[PDB]
Amino acid sequence: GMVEKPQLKFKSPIDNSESHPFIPLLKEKPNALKPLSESLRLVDDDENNPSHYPHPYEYEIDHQEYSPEILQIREEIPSKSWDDSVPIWVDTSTELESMLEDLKNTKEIAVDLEHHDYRSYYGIVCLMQISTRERDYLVDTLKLRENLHILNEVFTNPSIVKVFHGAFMDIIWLQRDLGLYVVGLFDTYHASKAIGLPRHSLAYLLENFANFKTSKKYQLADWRIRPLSKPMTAAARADTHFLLNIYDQLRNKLIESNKLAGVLYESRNVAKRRFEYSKYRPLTPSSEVYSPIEKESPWKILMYQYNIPPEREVLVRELYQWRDLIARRDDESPRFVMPNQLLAALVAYTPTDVIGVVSLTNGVTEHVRQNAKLLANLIRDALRNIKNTN
């Protein structure tokens, strides 16, 4: 079909202006050790790190003690039979409340998410998967975008282990879109590395410990689509359905070889990762902070040198900045507005009228088609400025 942009239905409108450092969406702060008061303040310009808000749960992540049953080798619990249950679809505040009540009665849960970034500037969390020893949950993070914050009661309860595989970006996505934080994380990716398994991916773990073969024929899928297709519903359920059992085996092996403390340390730091706008990103790019990383051509004159002439970097740069502004304005990804190959195509052929712009041998996007005149003017200016100057 066409898929209507889910953003249009968000309770709170999106803001890509980036006129202030990221502000935590957190209004309440359960399992608090340090009041939310001190949390929402600021950290005035340093030199390495410009002004910004700190991670609202950083303190707890450092002080909150782990569940004593995590340091103990325990009899593992096999994953429940896939066919013995259906994944529980959650898309109403009432369904959300019941799941929540259920999660509060666990010792650990497995969590994962599905994300979308083609038709959104920063990106949007489209689905959340949660598994208990007994059931698999599929949460519509689109329809419940503003309600999900209540999961912090469990996501920040240090008495409940939250298991994720390589959650470095998921931690970022969770705060940015849902204002969710995690205290009591166990990252199976770091567990796999510490133990020294040949491969460290989720698929590798699923294949060898749960005899489940994965199909990456969905990491390019569109998670905004409602209802979810059977195959996508299954592939999402598979992210958390087998994870707690894998958690048991890796944990026991870590205790058995005295490496658990290191994995918990690595995990606390994954959970401490803070999301910030590229504009207010710290100088030295560290793993402690994340800011939007262009998924396309090198800022300005690209290295994909489509034989990019000398005096055309000004043109290149204007196209880049124009693209970014339109992307931000319409809340779209830069590639949806204009992919590097098209941008490159414009710079290479330098069309100066609408006909030239829309008939580019390569092809054209809706945005380029709708701004053909502006682009033809922009390009014409670039050429005129060249013929002059020198």
Q: Which residues are annotated as a binding site for Mn(2+)?
A: 112, 114, 170, 239
Q: Is 337 helix (H, G, I), strand (E, B) or coil?
A: helix
What's the closest the beta carbon of residue 144 comes to Mn ion, in angstroms? 18
What's the closest the beta carbon of residue 115 comes to Mn ion, in angstroms? 8
Binding site per annotation, positions for AMP: 114-115, 173, 216, 219
Distance separating alpha carbons of residues 15 and 1, to the nearest angstrom: 27
60 binds Mn ion (CB under 5 A): no
Nearer to Mn ion, 215 or 257 (CB): 215
What's the closest the beta carbon of residue 311 comes to Mn ion, in angstroms? 45
Task: Output the CA angle 77-200-80, nearest 5 degrees.
Answer: 20
- Whether omega for the bond prior to residue 227 falls within 30 degrees of 0, making it cis, is yes
Which residue stretches of 64-130 are H helix? 93-103
What's the closest the beta carbon of residue 235 comes to Mn ion, in angstroms? 6
Binding site per annotation, positions for Zn(2+): 112, 114, 239
What's the closest the beta carbon of residue 287 comes to Mn ion, in angstroms? 17
Nearer to Mn ion, 238 or 264 (CB): 238
Q: Which two tokens stand for residue 3?
A: 């898929």
Nearer to Mn ion, 170 or 276 (CB): 170
Nearer to Mn ion, 214 or 252 (CB): 214
Nearer to Mn ion, 112 or 331 (CB): 112
**Binding-residue pattern over the window 199 to 238 for Mn ion, x denoting contact by CB under 5 A:** ----------------------------------------
Distance separating alpha carbons of residues 139 and 88, to the nearest angstrom: 8
Nearer to Mn ion, 126 or 289 (CB): 126
Count of residues interacting with Mn ion (CB under 5 A): 3
Distant-in-sequence, close-in-space partners of 347: CB < 8 Å, separation ≥ 6: 306, 308, 312, 315, 316, 319
Beta strands in 141-238 (DSSP E): 161-164, 185-187
Length of the chain: 390
What's the closest the beta carbon of residue 187 comes to Mn ion, in angstroms? 11
Q: Which two tokens stand for residue 36?
A: 């939310």
112 binds Mn ion (CB under 5 A): yes
Binding site per annotation, positions for UMP: 114-115, 173, 216, 219
Nearer to Mn ion, 60 or 112 (CB): 112
Nearer to Mn ion, 112 or 276 (CB): 112
Binding site per annotation, positions: 112, 114-115, 170, 173, 216, 219, 239
Q: Which two tokens stand for residue 205?
A: 């773990």
Q: Are 68 and 61 in contact (CB under 8 A)?
A: no
**Binding-residue pattern over the window 155 to 194 for Mn ion, x denoting contact by CB under 5 A:** ---------------x------------------------
Nearest to 223 by CA among 365, 334, 113: 113
Nearest to 267 by CA among 175, 173, 174, 162: 162
Q: Are 347 and 328 in contact (CB under 8 A)?
A: no
What's the closest the beta carbon of residue 114 comes to Mn ion, in angstroms? 5
What's the closest the beta carbon of residue 363 comes to Mn ion, in angstroms? 31
What residues numbered 232-261 form the site for Mn ion, per CB under 5 A? 239
Nearest to 296 by CA among 339, 330, 348, 346: 339
36: how many CB neighbours lie within 10 A of its CB? 15
Q: Are 352 and 376 in contact (CB under 8 A)?
A: yes
Distance separating alpha carbons of residues 219 and 343, to the nearest angstrom: 26
Contact footprint for Mn ion (CB under 5 A): 112, 170, 239
